[PDB]
Design an enzyme around this catalytic site. Structure first.
Site, short mmCIF file in Angstrom:
data_model
loop_
_atom_site.label_atom_id
_atom_site.label_comp_id
_atom_site.label_asym_id
_atom_site.label_seq_id
_atom_site.Cartn_x
_atom_site.Cartn_y
_atom_site.Cartn_z
CG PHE A 94 74.52 8.27 56.21
CD1 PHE A 94 74.63 8.00 54.83
CD2 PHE A 94 75.02 9.48 56.66
CE1 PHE A 94 75.28 8.91 53.97
CE2 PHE A 94 75.66 10.38 55.81
CZ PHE A 94 75.77 10.10 54.46
CG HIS A 137 81.03 10.75 47.48
ND1 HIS A 137 82.04 11.17 48.33
CD2 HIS A 137 80.04 11.65 47.62
CE1 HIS A 137 81.66 12.29 48.93
NE2 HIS A 137 80.44 12.59 48.53
CG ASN A 165 84.55 13.86 47.40
OD1 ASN A 165 83.89 14.86 47.77
ND2 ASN A 165 84.09 12.99 46.51
CD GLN A 215 83.67 9.98 56.10
OE1 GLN A 215 82.48 10.16 55.96
NE2 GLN A 215 84.56 10.91 55.82
NE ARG A 258 79.78 12.83 60.22
CZ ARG A 258 78.94 13.20 59.26
NH1 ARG A 258 79.08 12.72 58.03
NH2 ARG A 258 77.96 14.05 59.52
CG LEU A 292 76.29 10.14 48.87
CD1 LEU A 292 77.03 9.25 49.87
CD2 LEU A 292 76.60 11.60 49.13
CG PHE A 340 81.34 6.58 52.49
CD1 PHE A 340 82.03 7.45 51.63
CD2 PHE A 340 80.07 6.16 52.10
CE1 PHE A 340 81.46 7.87 50.44
CE2 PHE A 340 79.49 6.61 50.90
CZ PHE A 340 80.20 7.46 50.07
C1 LIG Z 1 79.53 10.18 52.94
C2 LIG Z 1 80.87 10.77 52.53
O1 LIG Z 1 80.89 12.19 52.81
C3 LIG Z 1 81.99 12.89 52.57
O2 LIG Z 1 82.94 12.38 52.03
C4 LIG Z 1 81.92 14.34 52.97
N1 LIG Z 1 83.19 14.84 53.46
C5 LIG Z 1 83.72 14.30 54.57
O3 LIG Z 1 83.07 13.43 55.15
N2 LIG Z 1 84.89 14.69 55.02
C6 LIG Z 1 85.84 15.63 54.44
C7 LIG Z 1 87.03 14.99 53.71
C8 LIG Z 1 86.91 13.76 53.05
C9 LIG Z 1 88.02 13.26 52.33
C10 LIG Z 1 89.22 13.93 52.27
N3 LIG Z 1 90.27 13.38 51.57
C11 LIG Z 1 89.35 15.15 52.96
C12 LIG Z 1 88.26 15.65 53.67
C13 LIG Z 1 85.45 14.09 56.25
C14 LIG Z 1 84.63 14.33 57.50
N4 LIG Z 1 84.67 13.54 58.59
N5 LIG Z 1 83.78 14.10 59.53
N6 LIG Z 1 83.20 15.23 58.94
N7 LIG Z 1 83.74 15.30 57.71
#
Ligand SMILES: CCOC(=O)CNC(=O)N(Cc1ccc(N)cc1)Cc1nnn[nH]1
Length: 165
Positions: free
Chosen positions: A60, A126, A102, A63, A55, A122, A113
């Protein structure tokens, strides 16, 4: 004493792009820094080598770190499936900050990320644990393969990774 440094060698549809290196703030968040370091060397028998950035949203962040399900639903830490939020001493101040992804309080695994903008909303949610040292230009090149919804136009992989020094 000296904070450790790790590298990722990045590829785009299998073709080499460049290297990104990171300082890990073991002085302020030792438990979280150690998890990322060990996943980068692969010394526990699992880790980041061969995984993808699933992603990428221009303006932004980029990830990755989901080495078990490859899509944002997986990953695991060196301490078990999940571990606690260590502290929130460091903030999301601008491009190059390295922070844990998370799914709620105390749910850190392996996903992370790299910020490409200031992301102050955030802060306190985070855990920030490092920053890009060399190769921010390579992160900017990666970012151009993202889109508004985060789907990438070419496959962005960690072809190799490890610890420098
Ligand atoms: C800017 C950071 O934002 C975040 O962390 C929000 N949650 C997130 O992105 N997740 C869920 C996630 C994360 C870590 C773990 N360990 C498990 C699930 C993955 C994801 N990828 N695509 N959509 N969602």
């Amino acid at each position: 004493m000296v904070n450790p440094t790790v590298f990722f060698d990045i590829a785009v549809d299998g073709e080499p792009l460049g290297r990104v290196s990171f300082e890990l703030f073991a002085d302020k968040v030792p438990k979280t820094a150690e998890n990322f370091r060990a996943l980068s060397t692969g010394e526990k028998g699992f880790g980041y080598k061969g995984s993808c950035f699933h992603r990428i949203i221009p303006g932004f962040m980029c990830q990755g770190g989901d080495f078990t399900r490859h899509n944002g639903t997986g990953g695991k830490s060196i301490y078990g499936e999940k571990f606690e939020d260590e502290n929130f001493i460091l903030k999301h101040t601008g491009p190059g900050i390295l922070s844990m992804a998370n799914a709620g309080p105390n749910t850190n695994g392996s996903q992370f990320f790299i910020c490409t903008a200031k992301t102050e909303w955030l802060d306190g949610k985070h855990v920030v644990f490092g920053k890009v040292k060399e190769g921010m230009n390579i992160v900017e090149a990666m970012e151009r393969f993202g889109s508004r919804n985060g789907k990438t136009s070419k496959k962005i992989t960690i072809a190799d990774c490890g610890q420098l020094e």
